[model samples]
Target: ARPCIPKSFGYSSVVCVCNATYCDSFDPPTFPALGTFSRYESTRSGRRMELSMGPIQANHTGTGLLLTLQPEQKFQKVKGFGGAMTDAAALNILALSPPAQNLLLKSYFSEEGIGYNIIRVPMASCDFSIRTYTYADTPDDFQLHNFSLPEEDTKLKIPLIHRALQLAQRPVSLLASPWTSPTWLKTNGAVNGKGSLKGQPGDIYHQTWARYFVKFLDAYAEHKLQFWAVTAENEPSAGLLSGYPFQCLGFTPEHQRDFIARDLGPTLANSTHHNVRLLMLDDQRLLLPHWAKVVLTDPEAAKYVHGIAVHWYLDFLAPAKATLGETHRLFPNTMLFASEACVGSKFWEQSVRLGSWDRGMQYSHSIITNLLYHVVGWTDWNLALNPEGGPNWVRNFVDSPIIVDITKDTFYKQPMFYHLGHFSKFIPEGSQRVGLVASQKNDLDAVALMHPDGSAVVVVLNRSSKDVPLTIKDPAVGFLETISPGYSIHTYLWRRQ
Candidate 1:
């Protein structure tokens, strides 16, 4: 047999052969249509055809991902998940009125993908909320005395939260933390920026504020809401910055452990709502070591403290892993959860990343990376933010998975939503991550699991410029598929044989 080349190069070219080849010749090839071409007779007595050919290319692989799952090494088991859909944030989005807000709520509670079962709200007034409401209104001289939740928030924020949960009809875990203590309680008499509560070590509500946490919890009960976890404050370091509402002067770890063990923890135990876990300071992971030294040292505080919760702003992803390991070694009983992080302002700008793809992949990458450290759950920043970003009186607004337009009732489900859904939708609460092999040559990142039902789920992410051919065999299902490029994520579900 001789290989023949058509004299004319044409747009539509076909290979015609009489001999047969083996099965392992080549996989499926993608081709374009031969729109237009011309054929001419040559002096050699043969016809020549002119055709166009397209370059064949595959997709890219996902890289820079590191994860390992072993069923036997169940270091930190998950206690399930709740979310941090701040009531005020929900109110701001829902303020668009009934029909519009209802659309947002439906999208939120509907279990089309990963459902949100935990919601967070500020104890009094966080800058993210309406900014200036307080539960306890008291004189300058008064301590935690007259503290109470003003009527304004209840009318909008709290009710909006409860309604969303009711629509989802799933029991949700609530996490409440003080964005800032009331002005009277703080030495600065101002809620904006980081301000310390006035007086000496024993003078303030070190003990009384314990009762304050109880008060917030009890009051929410009137709305029939139960809190799953509550942190002392949000970003105690940035509280002084004035960009976010209700800043807390930094609290030492010892102080935190003492507060939980004595005041807040005991208050819960006495009430019907005591099961709520007291999470330590809500800061970034970089502060884990510092917090551990303070809290873990106390045997009593260790009893009430459930774990440490951190946000994602500092970008210290690697150190966080090592720090988590060290902290867990000292306090092996505690859990770690990355409670809140948003599309930070700096990350949204075009100059920082590869368009919105960076934002979407980063959001998903954070979840998967944190899972490696035995993180129980990840609560993204705002469940939904306005088109302008937010009611950023605190000026720290950023993007979220969903962005809604109040004026047009138009909302965009970002690529980040699909990225997270790849995992949240399939992995139930009790499921455990069991096996995974991180690839080095290609840009494909993977996480595999031996699910409780004896089935398996493997998640592969491709962040490169080509498509990848996948050959995977799960429990009951096994097949081959192609993956795409530009931060694409695909989940392969299978059952055990």
Candidate 2:
């Protein structure tokens, strides 16, 4: 394993700094033999993915805590964890020299680094870009004859995404989301703010807009990139309401359903990319069952959609345990994917939090809670941002797990990065969440997963101030007796006898 070059940031404490020659790395993981297990940990005091090995203990007692795993009772199949590849992320990474850029990319996608198998790509432009844009610009071109991609798609984001695809250990999946429709096609005559498409379902406007999505998919395929899925729009409700800024499109549940059933569904089904999944309601958790019910209850719309895309914004207002579970109960066949999350996105907060463990825990807490309530995958908003936290056209900024400093030609891995690693590194795609029984105690959170290979992975997190003594048991292979430090995360992997 490589050591961290711990250095303090301007705003606060220490972070792991990576440049060309000194970037940190972990030895590629290996599955243990019978009666043995592997453990990887990240602590509150800055231990990042420290690895150790141990043998399962004989029958024992007096630990006062028993965490049991039931691989038989499986839940959602993991779709994997990753972050967005916005224009800002691509721009920041490209600012570095080629060697540094490769190191940063490998840090996330390589087997020696924490493995991120999937990534998000905005369809054309979003608030995260340097400016506003769309694939088509010519007005009244309802046939979308003028449709073409932006330069960023060719010279920037696509190249970065191509390299990431080459480097990932597992087959990479890309999810596409559109932040806005062209201004000429919207009722408000603006890129954003209180606008709907100029026409209703089955009209010339709606038909062309649906074709727009297929056009995007076709354009990407021309460059050898294929999307695994696409959301109907990004934060659709923001555009439905007044006074919201940034590049957004409106989609009330009923309207979105009709548009999909009438235009998008039929268009995609007839197109070459019919297999690409469709996810609706790319909004906050607060939208909940209401959004799911309105859009998914109708057989026409539900037939076209494969899943629901939820954002982490407003997650505090709606408990994941309640909202996510209720959604799952209502639509067991459809998947739940947390499409976006970030720290310091709120107006009152600081844009970047340098080395704050609390901020890291915030990410972990959300991931754990979301997984507990049937979320198949979790995605962070931006892969990397400038020190100021953006290249945002709308002046909105947010913290990312990785921060690139142009002046220093370096990128720092924040504590949040390690916190996420505790999950993403060990949990591969296709691992199904299983039953884990822990006492209803203070701030101890965990979820267990059963991999297709028959090995099981258990992640234990201690969020409380006190140390936790846990005997994590897999009845077939015995138990692991370990004392977890306060504010630490542990991932244990083992195969059954």
Candidate 3:
């Protein structure tokens, strides 16, 4: 291998064409060879050959190729690999004592140019906020015990969140999920930790509960913010695994169903939020099956369900979508959205450092896998976290897409952010997953998306250490391209004129 001077290279008005002449689909005997390196440059003299190539991983199966590059070089066109897929979701933007919620939101959402479109705000404080408090004084109060969001929310987090949405050029969706029920409503009388809702507060608890949603919507709307979707609970299945302050309810399918379809859904319908979607099951991949069984078996709940929301805590969630086939076979309109995934997690960081891979690839892969299962939107866990991942009470703090210091007013964007940007920035809504063909490359994975705007995006991942040379020959348009795999994720997109 030879090292060349780093020269910036790019081209405008370039088109990509793949003929699909060669295709292969085989199960690898084991992990493909990895850690191989190679280098290539323009061989022909005076040929203005601007190597227009990047990485694209839309799915985990296989990706297509369309290119006619100078031949005889090892270029494993990384293709057909993906992971968790985020749809339209938002970050809670965890703001605590040292991390001024004010400064963080201002830089990230306010004037930073990158504003949040979908945000998940807390009903009561979770790890995101410095303190947790329920809106109503009594859990069972139907009218809400003099509930007030402004008293607490406006302190900084809410205003900043609202302003950020306005600046983002779109309405943000508030994925309303309480980390724990109100203190008066829980078993431990605490808003944070692993616990369940025991008894009703008052006869008004259910009805007043519905009104709470209405109140938030009305108030936020007055400030130009809106709630897109609402989740009944945040990982209701896992209460307090790592000792985090929590207000939890051992929400069974029956409870969640009654609350959403029967209660919240109807209340939302009559209120100003009738149009906002009522998303269900904001849990990790492992809990998807149980959530599905609850939805599929319930009659009233299934009627109002928008889609299954997920977090990427479980490893390899590709199978979770398949379990829903039985349910979707009946209700095809249902969609899937990834709610929260972060990088600081030990599991995620390990994947990053050892593999010499970027976290963006992990997020990109998640998006592709969910896309394969017909998931439409993807949401990351946190928009911003403190330097150490959190001022978290849960003690399960992990990395997030963006990190900021309230004290220093400094921040850094993570690799996962770039990974998501590569896809979300390009594959806007309405783009459909086309198809892919896998061949002899044991370490390669691929997926393709044909946009309505006459363009195609190809995502490729080479999971091998050995530098594998690969070609994507799309004969349909008589084009082929070669790619090199250096154990990194790549996304290559082009206009298909």
Best by lDDT: 2
The C-alpha local distance difference test score for the whole of candidate 2 amounts to 0.87
Q: Is candidate 1 or candidate 2 better by lDDT?
A: 2
Output candidate 2 Cα RMSD: 1.4
Clashes of each: 38, 0, 80
Error of 2 at 311 (Å): 0.3
Q: How many residue pairs in model 2 have overlapping backbones?
A: 0
Instruction: Tell me the TM-score of each prediction against the true structure.
Output: 0.77, 0.98, 0.71
Candidate 2 lDDT over residue span 284-321, tens digit each: 88788889999888999899999999998622555765
lDDT of 1: 0.57
Cα lDDT for residue 232, candidate 2: 92
Alpha-carbon shift of residue 125 in model 2 (angstroms): 1.1
| Ranked by TM-score, top first | 2, 1, 3
In angstroms, the error of model 2 at 408 is 0.7
lDDT of 3 at 430: 57
In model 2, the runs with Cα more than 4 Å from the true position are 10-13, 314-316, 439-442
Comparing 1 with 3 on TM-score, the higher-scoring candidate is 1
